[PDB]
Amino acid sequence: ENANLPATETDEEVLIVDENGSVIVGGCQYDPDESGPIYTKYREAKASTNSTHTPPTSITNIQPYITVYRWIRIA
Amino acid sequence: ESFQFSPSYVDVSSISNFIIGENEYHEIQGSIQQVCKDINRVYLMESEG
């Protein structure tokens, strides 16, 4: 579960929201020609890792085990 | 239409004087457009691309 997870950080340095930053966004501009490639990445948000599945691979905690017959003595 | 041919012509370059050609030419197909707001500041380069 989420609380089962080491401390994860993605390698190459990615931008995020803040009020403190160096990167100017711009809120408005010339986009006078709509004709420029209009590349709008979407909102600041949380980036889903392997969102496809909560149900991960379940590591067998079975350890090398020879099933051996057990008929317990009634007495 | 000129050029009575012979043998003894050896390299194409020698008789290359007689070959049909286009004399070149120039056309327009212009009117361009502006990038950003500056119509004066544009440049033009034509090539294979």
CB-based contact A30 B36, cutoff 8 Å: yes
Torsions phi, psi of B38, nearest 5? Answer: -100, 110
Instruction: For chain A, say whether B37 makes contact (Cβ under 8 Å).
Output: yes
Q: φ and ψ at B12, to 5 degrees?
A: -60, -35
Resolution (angstroms) stands at 3.8
Tokens coding B20: 């049909």
Quote the distance between the C-alpha of residue B29 and its chain's center.
16
B35: contact with A, CB 8 A cutoff = yes
Q: Would an 8 Å CB–CB cutoff place B36 in contact with chain A?
A: yes
Residues with Cβ within 8 Å of residue A32, at least 6 apart in sequence:
B36, B37
What does the block give as tokens for B8? 């003894």
Q: Scanning the structure block, which residue is given the tokens 């350890």?
A: A63
Measured in angstroms, the CA of A56 and the nearest CA of chain B are apart by 50
